[PDB]
Design a protein around this nucleic acid. Structure first.
Ligand SMILES: CO[C@@H]1[C@H](O)[C@H](n2cnc3c(=O)nc(N)[nH]c32)O[C@H]1COP(=O)(O)OP(=O)(O)OP(=O)(O)O
Ligand SMILES: [Mg+2]
Ligand SMILES: [Zn+2]
Ligand SMILES: [Zn+2]
Ligand SMILES: [Zn+2]
Lengths: 115, 257, 528, 8, 82, 67, 49, 49, 428, 44
RNA sequence: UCAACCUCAUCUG
């Protein structure tokens, strides 16, 4: 009777922002990105790619509550770098990696067949 | 500061299985690709059932559950079909759904096995993976099952009926060299199929500078989507999720400025 | 009769006046929630929709309350009733009442229970005042009350079908009284025994013991992930304990960030050698036992129920007595969160391999049992030949029983010690016993070595049949097997007679519990 | 179920 | 009693703090004038806590001694327990 | 009551395999050999067929309410 | 006629006694039902020894 | 059930093979409600003549 | 051997237990005679010549395991568990959901729970055959991992796989039957089944009376939400009074069967059965066959659950901290034997005192099928993909869904109905 | 309405305030028969 | 804009 509908896991209700950016006052050059209706799938990918960046001092993600559907990513970068830029670059790098993976998987498929 | 270039080598390709290896990739990327295999690959399955007459022993919602779990061929038109929420028309239409019908009566004395074959689709591309058959119910003489169903696009995050895959086998570091798992007695542990160690050596020597790479996948299709296209659709869907995230992030950054 | 109406329990005086059924109360099953804080409780939406709190309409809250009234009883964050100044209760459930939706100062909007409301949480029986505590509401999906696991011990609650009552204060005055006199962070230390009522428990305790070993080294990503779940974090990553060859933090180094303020504590781990304090390596402690927290930093040690548990002088108790109750609440919550995520990494389990011991261990256990049975045979022969002489204050029967019991108990203890020697570091029974999370060395011994003597009414299994225990045994057999000694372990499996005698012992324990409840309840009522 | 000094 | 010959503790007890905070909260929710300048606080209990910290709650506690006499201690006079 | 569609643990379709399982048991095949022939590999899928109790046949003995 | 005695099900005087499982199915009774209870006012009652 | 004496409730040795040792209700009826063992039979009675 | 061979051919040989008694092979012994009889638990171990304990055995037990009852006979490896845990399992097995009878469709019984997909246990006791547990099982075999995953299995709770639940795992049907009898007490005062009318009948409620048919009884197949009018009964008032029955609050079911008969008095009598399909939630109670139960702490999808190399994700995750204090080692032995049975294809034998089934033999059997001797398995964390450092005990164990469900227990009160005498809130 | 007979499974139409006895068999147990309105089941 | 009390038995922590 109190069971949430399944579509709540990924469908934004009206007036809900996918991303909200709030700066972290405790430390300079740090930010906190709150992604709504997202899970570990995107969070772990983004955290790993942010960790690969040398100018990202801190990168972490958390699900504040398993029953609710939200991801919080803290990103702290060096001076002369912006955490928002680090997030954008992480996303673009992951997109490029996934596209390369798609192309090579298609080639591997075509080669496993037809020979 | 940039993404690595992954490489794929497909070892096995059968109508039910894809065994491949992804090298030069992160553990997070590999795990999330597996995760998208399981939960975020769109598929077609029955989600609306209306039972005109059910005199079978199984109650109506039991029949509806079993009908939902029946796989449906979704190779091509699942990409063409729209989600019901996206479709402009009220309720369901040919663009947002596929209609199935079941009209079975056991007039004969012998028990009638209602199968997925008795489900008849309005569009030929979606069929209940019939081309034995999944048994929906057994009908005694004088028992009848009549129903109309609508099948919609969706992914396994909504419901396990929309899982395109049966079992995604994911393994990294077949010989424990990163010591991510610390065996109390290494010798008692069976060797992995992908293990390259000699029989004498239970574990590879600890590699201090190693990082998890060369992930091994075995994706078994449920028959709705071909095992190759499960992987391709999962990669494309993860890329689309990242692109949507980037678009929203750019909009909010512009708003902050 | 009129006397019967007023006389006993269920009478007017006791059943209707001293205690009575009350409104604004909700009962449901409880399930764990590690993510909730100590004071937070998890409330289903239906329960929060039925229960209401009346809020006086003021100039500063008139807009929000009018929005809630507009939503009504149907939309969840709404109002069930509007009480006018005259006392007339406009009903928002039944029909729009468009003219009566207006709010003015002095009206009372009976809004639905929302996040941040203070509610009393109760479990029966309320044996002590920690059984009723004030919790801050958080509304979560599904239909169970969800409470933090550090709060289970005061309530005596386990999530195996238990239910908890919830009482909602209906006035600001009583809300403030509940919040101040009964809030869970204020209830951490009991006046009964001047110890904390709550401590780290279950998975978190075992994972803390594993986390604070010297061996635990955490890489950069794991450190960042764990610092994500530390709410009191200053945002500064500590310099790792090992800078080169690769930057690796330590479990103690990260737990030092959990410990709040500057707290000074000295404890000792459960497996602390008594020789270490007297001899050399007092402050080096080869086993990393002892526990030294200086300036709120864990310099050395492995934490267990003695350091993070409900005992006087614990790190929790010192935190409450030094930093205050709010900071201690944060301390509990942070321990649970970051240690549970590290446990997600390391993992914990129990299997058959824990119950298995070495072949040499099993052989030694068998030899000890053989020697004990032979010694009992010798004592029985001495008694039969009348060589035995009564111990002062005891009959010959009583002294014979005492000697046999001593031999059997000594053999049982020796087998248990052999089984415990067999245990490896990786053994998980030993992990749970050492951490203090669950189990005891007695349980390990019974699992691995010997179940032990089955005794009913403080004596070996009685001669229920005519001069024998079971029909399978010959009459007048006082040996270990006949009178109830179980040499097989649980893993080995009890033989049929041992099974029946073990059932006799378990039955006695169950009867004791069931009989105990009522007598203790009567005593408690009389004292109060 | 253990011994005479323990528990039943 | 008078300012002299006050024998009760100068510190405010936990129960006195609870009842004072609740009473002031109820008054504030009943449109009573607020002594402290609220910094965007719209919760009557939070405003009452803020007033208690600033020692501006306009209440005097009458503590009844067991002999029947009473002592009037102002909230300002009492030392806040927390 | 009737063989479930899809193994609970993984989701491989096991609903089409019960009649073939019974036929292979009638042939001579041991339960394990029949399970292997049907293609069930993981013990999760083998649990579905191995532990299944088919009560639908007992329920079909009772006459229908409407004939 | 002096009275009516409730009959324990599947006892010698029950109608279900001596009936094969097919006949029990024809009467909408379970072949596996043990019996040993009385139907009093439509409710199954079991005498406890 | 009200009686708190722990004598009538305890598993007697003579229950072996005739009453289940494990199966008893828990609460006020521990050891007071019992269940027959699988092979146990109860005498129906006979004429001593 | 003659008697055993004749009994083995029992049917079409007209040899039965009564012939065994008549031959003098077996004998019925009561407690008084049990006091005067030397018994042997087993023939081979005891009757045969050894160091002579007794040489005057007068009887032999047919099998020791028969000392247990009906509910304790389903417990696998009961000799490896602590004694109170077997009592707990007897109590809980009386509460498991399964197909109670095959004629459940015909019976209109209040509070009937029937499980969708019952399964027979992979590890079974022989005496279960005589309890008909195979014919009408109660519970499902489930892949269970004994691990501390996210803290939602702590204390006694249980983490469950949401995908498995979505695939039919432990889904049940709850039938509630309502009875109403129209009756005439006064000569001018009668009760009639009819659809109540707002004007004609003085007593009415907000509850929708539209679903009632012409006869005043809801037809089968109509969804009925809580507080809707199942049966419409009106009493002539010497205009009319509404005595119509309503659904129990939060029932939220679909009508299954509506029967209209005449009772013994000759008055019209109506029974209406409502189906509510209950899917496992995160409050429902599940228990193993070894006396340790627990509510569902949380449900994670298949992507979130830990996975083995083969891709198997546990249906149920139970906290390891349950095992040590309770000492239910039979649970661990049943997991190991179930793994062996599922890979082998046989059904494991867990008779209490077999003496031919050691734990070591089960481990050696499991080794042949490619798994670790002790049943541990390298589990990969579902969220991050990293191998869990401690290898986790996984196996197929039989679990039962107890009738206690959170939906039946959730309750809340706010200025509701009040008693007449005390003028205090009501009870229940 | 129309009530299906318990035993002979033949639909008989019984008016209100009429004894519940099937024509041609006499059985006193009738069943209300499934509704014409149709209810949507989500296959979930 | 809206339904009884007794009694007993069975279960729950
Ligand atoms: C731990 O103490 C509790 C409480 O004291 C409360 N309680 C329970 N029954 C009663 C009763 O009749 N009367 C009163 N007054 N209180 C009662 O229940 C006790 C334990 O009982 P248990 O021993 O069965 O708890 P498992 O050890 O069995 O827990 P598993 O592993 O099943 O989750
Ligand atoms: Mg409990
Ligand atoms: Zn459409
Ligand atoms: Zn499977
Ligand atoms: Zn008829």
């Amino acid at each position: 009777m109190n069971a949430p509908p399944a579509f709540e896991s990924f469908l934004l209700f009206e007036g809900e922002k996918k991303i909200t950016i709030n700066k972290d006052t405790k430390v300079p050059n740090a930010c906190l990105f709150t992604i709504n209706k997202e899970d570990h799938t995107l969070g772990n990918i983004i955290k790993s790619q942010l960790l690969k960046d040398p100018q990202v001092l801190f990168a972490g993600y958390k699900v504040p509550h398993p029953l609710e559907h939200k991801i919080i990513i803290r990103v702290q970068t060096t001076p002369d770098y912006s955490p928002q830029e680090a997030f954008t670059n992480a996303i673009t790098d992951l997109i490029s990696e996934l596209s390369l993976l798609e192309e090579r998987f298609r080639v591997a498929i075509k080669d496993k067949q037809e020979g | 500061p940039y993404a690595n270039q992954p490489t794929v080598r497909i070892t096995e390709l059968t109508d039910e299985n894809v065994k491949f290896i992804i090298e030069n990739t992160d553990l997070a990327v590999a795990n999330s690709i597996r995760r998208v295999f399981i939960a975020e690959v769109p598929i077609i399955a029955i989600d609306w059932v209306q039972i005109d007459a059910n005199s079978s022993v199984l109650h109506d919602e039991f029949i509806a559950h079993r009908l939902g779990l029946i796989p449906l061929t979704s190779d091509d038109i699942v990409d063409k079909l729209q989600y019901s929420r996206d479709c402009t028309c009220e309720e369901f239409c040919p663009e947002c759904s596929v209609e199935f019908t079941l009209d079975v009566r056991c007039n004969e004395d012998q028990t009638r096995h209602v199968t997925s074959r008795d489900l008849i689709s309005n569009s030929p591309r979606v069929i209940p993976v019939t081309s034995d058959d999944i048994l929906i119910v057994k009908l005694r003489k004088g028992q009848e099952l009549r129903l109309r169903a609508y099948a919609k696009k969706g992914f396994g995050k909504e419901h396990a009926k929309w899982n395109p895959t049966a079992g995604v086998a994911f393994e990294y570091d077949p010989d424990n060299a990163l010591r991510h798992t610390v065996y109390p007695k290494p010798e008692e542990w069976p060797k992995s199929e992908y293990s390259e160690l000699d029989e004498d050596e239970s574990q590879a020597p600890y590699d201090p500078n190693g990082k998890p790479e060369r992930f091994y996948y075995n994706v078994e299709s449920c028959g709705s989507l071909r095992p190759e296209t499960i992987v391709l659709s999962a990669l494309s869907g993860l890329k689309k999720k990242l692109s949507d995230l980037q678009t929203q992030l750019s909009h909010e950054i512009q708003s902050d400025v | 009769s009129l006397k019967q109406r007023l006389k006993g329990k269920e009478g007017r005086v006791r059943g209707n006046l001293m205690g009575k059924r009350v409104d604004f109360s909700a009962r449901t099953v409880i399930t764990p929630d590690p993510n909730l804080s100590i004071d937070q409780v998890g409330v289903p939406r239906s329960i929060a929709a039925n229960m209401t709190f009346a809020e006086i309409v003021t100039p500063f809250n008139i807009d929000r309350l009018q929005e809630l009234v507009r939503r009504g009883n149907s939309q969840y964050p709404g109002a069930k009733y509007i009480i006018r100044d005259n006392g007339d209760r406009i009903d928002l459930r039944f029909h729009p009442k468009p003219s009566d939706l207006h709010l003015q100062t002095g009206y009372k909007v009976e809004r639905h229970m929302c996040d941040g409301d203070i509610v009393i949480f109760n479990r029966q029986p309320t044996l002590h005042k920690m059984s009723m505590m004030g919790h801050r509401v958080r509304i979560l999906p599904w239909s169970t009350f969800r409470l933090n696991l550090s709060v289970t011990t005061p309530y005596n609650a386990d999530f195996d079908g238990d239910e908890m009552n919830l009482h909602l204060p209906q006035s600001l005055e009583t809300r403030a009284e509940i919040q101040e006199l009964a809030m869970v962070p204020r209830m951490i230390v009991t006046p009964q025994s001047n110890r904390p009522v709550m401590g780290i428990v279950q998975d978190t305790l075992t994972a803390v013991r594993k986390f604070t070993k010297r061996d635990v080294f955490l890489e950069r990503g794991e450190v960042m992930n764990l610092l994500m779940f530390l709410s009191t974090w200053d945002g500064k990553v500590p310099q790792p304990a090992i800078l080169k060859p690769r930057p690796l933090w330590t479990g103690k180094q990260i737990f030092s960030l959990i410990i709040p303020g500057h707290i000074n504590c000295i404890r000792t781990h459960s497996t602390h050698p008594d020789d270490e304090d007297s001899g050399p390596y007092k402050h080096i402690s080869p086993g990393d036992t002892k526990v030294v927290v200086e300036n709120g930093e864990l310099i050395m040690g492995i934490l267990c129920k003695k350091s993070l548990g409900t005992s006087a002088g614990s790190l929790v108790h010192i935190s409450y007595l030094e930093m205050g109750h709010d900071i201690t609440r944060l301390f509990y919550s942070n321990i649970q969160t970051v240690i549970n995520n590290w446990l997600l990494i390391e993992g914990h389990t129990i299997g058959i391999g824990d119950s298995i011991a070495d072949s040499k261990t099993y052989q030694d256990i068998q030899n000890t049992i053989k020697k004990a049975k032979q010694d009992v045979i010798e004592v029985i022969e001495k008694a039969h030949n009348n060589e035995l002489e009564p111990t002062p204050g005891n009959t010959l029967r009583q002294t014979f029983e005492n000697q046999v019991n001593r031999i059997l108990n000594d053999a049982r203890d020796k087998t248990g010690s052999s089984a415990q020697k067999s245990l490896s570091e990786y053994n998980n029974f030993k992990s749970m016993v050492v951490s203090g999370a669950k189990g005891s060395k007695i349980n390990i011994s019974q699992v691995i070595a010997v179940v032990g003597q089955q005794n009913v009414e403080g004596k070996r299994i009685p001669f229920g049949f005519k001069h024998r225990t079971l029909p399978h045994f010959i009459k007048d057999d006082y040996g270990p097997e006949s009178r109830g000694f179980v040499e097989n372990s649980y893993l080995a499996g009890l033989t049929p007679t041992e099974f029946f005698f073990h059932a006799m012992g378990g039955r006695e324990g169950l009867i004791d519990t069931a009989v105990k409840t009522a007598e203790t309840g009567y005593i408690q009522r009389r004292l109060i | 179920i253990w011994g005479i000094g323990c528990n039943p | 009693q008078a300012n002299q010959k006050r024998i009760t503790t100068p510190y405010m007890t936990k129960y006195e703090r609870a009842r004072v905070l609740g009473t002031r909260a109820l008054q504030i929710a009943m449109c009573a004038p607020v002594m402290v300048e609220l910094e965007g606080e719209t919760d009557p209990l939070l405003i009452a806590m803020k007033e208690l910290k600033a020692r501006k709650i306009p209440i005097i506690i009458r503590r009844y001694l067991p002999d029947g006499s009473y002592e009037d201690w102002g909230v300002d006079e009492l030392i806040i327990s927390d | 009551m009737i063989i479930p569609v899809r193994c609970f643990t993984c989701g491989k379709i096991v609903g089409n395999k019960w009649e073939a399982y019974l036929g292979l048991l009638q042939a001579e095949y041991t339960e394990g050999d029949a399970l292997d022939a049907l293609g069930l590999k993981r013990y999760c899928c083998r649990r579905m067929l191995l532990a299944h109790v088919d009560l639908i046949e007992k329920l079909l003995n009772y006459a229908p309410l409407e004939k | 006629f002096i009275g009516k005695i409730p009959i324990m099900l599947r006892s010698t005087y029950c109608l279900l006694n001596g009936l094969t499982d097919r006949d029990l199915c024809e009467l909408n009774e379970c072949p596996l039902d043990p019996g040993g209870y009385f139907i009093i006012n439509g409710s199954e009652k079991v005498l406890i020894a | 059930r009200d009686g708190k004496l722990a004598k009538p409730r305890q598993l007697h040795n003579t229950l072996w093979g005739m009453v289940c040792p494990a199966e008893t209700p828990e609460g006020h009826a521990v050891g007071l409600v019992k269940n027959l063992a699988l092979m146990a039979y109860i005498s129906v009675g006979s004429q001593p003549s | 051997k003659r008697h055993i061979d004749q009994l083995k051919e029992r049917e079409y040989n007209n040899y039965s237990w009564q012939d065994l008694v008549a031959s003098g092979v077996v004998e019925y012994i009561d407690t008084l005679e049990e006091e005067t009889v030397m018994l042997a638990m087993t023939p081979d171990d005891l009757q045969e010549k050894e160091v002579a304990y007794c040489s005057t055995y007068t009887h032999c037990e047919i099998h020791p395991s028969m000392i247990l009852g009906v509910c304790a006979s389903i417990i696998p490896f009961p000799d490896h568990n602590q004694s109170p845990r077997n009592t707990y399992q007897s109590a809980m097995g009386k509460q498991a959901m399964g197909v109670y009878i095959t004629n459940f469709h015909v019976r209109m019984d209040t509070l009937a729970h029937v499980l969708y997909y019952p399964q027979k246990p992979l590890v079974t006791t022989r005496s279960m055959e005589y309890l008909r547990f195979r014919e009408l099982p109660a519970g499902i075999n489930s892949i269970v991992a004994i691990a501390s995953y996210t803290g939602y299995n702590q204390e006694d709770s249980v983490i469950m796989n949401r995908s498995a639940v979505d695939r039919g795992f432990f889904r049940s049907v709850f039938y509630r039957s309502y009875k109403e009898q129209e009756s005439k007490k006064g000569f001018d005062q009668e009760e009639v089944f009819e659809k109540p009318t707002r004007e004609t009948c003085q007593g009415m409620r907000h509850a929708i009376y539209d679903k009632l048919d012409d006869d005043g009884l809801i037809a089968p197949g109509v969804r009925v939400s809580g507080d809707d009018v199942i049966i419409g009964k009106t009493v002539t008032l010497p205009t009319k009074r509404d005595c119509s029955t309503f659904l129990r609050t939060s029932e939220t079911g679909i009508v299954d069967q509506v029967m209209v008969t005449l009772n013994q008095e000759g008055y019209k009598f109506c029974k209406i059965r409502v189906r509510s399909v209950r899917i496992p939630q995160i409050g429902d109670k599940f228990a193993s066959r070894h006396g340790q139960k627990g509510t569902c702490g949380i449900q994670y999808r298949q992507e979130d659950m830990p996975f083995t190399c083969e891709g198997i994700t546990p249906d149920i995750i139970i906290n390891p901290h349950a095992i040590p204090s309770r000492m239910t080692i039979g649970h661990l032995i049943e997991c190991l034997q179930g793994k062996v049975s599922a890979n082998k294809g046989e059904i494991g034998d867990a008779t209490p005192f077999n003496d031919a089934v050691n734990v070591q033999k089960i481990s050696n059997l499991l080794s042949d099928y490619g798994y670790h001797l002790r049943g541990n398995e390298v589990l990969y964390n579902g969220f991050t993909g990293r191998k869990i450092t401690s290898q986790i005990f996984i196996g197929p164990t039989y679990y039962q869904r107890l009738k206690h469900m959170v939906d039946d227990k959730i309750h809340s009160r706010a200025r509701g109905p009040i008693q007449i005498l005390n003028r205090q809130p009501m009870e229940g | 309405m129309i009530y299906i007979c318990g035993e002979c499974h033949t639909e008989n139409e019984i008016k209100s305030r009429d004894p519940i006895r099937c024509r041609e068999c006499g059985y006193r147990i009738m069943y209300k028969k499934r509704t014409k309105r149709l209810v949507v089941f989500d296959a979930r």
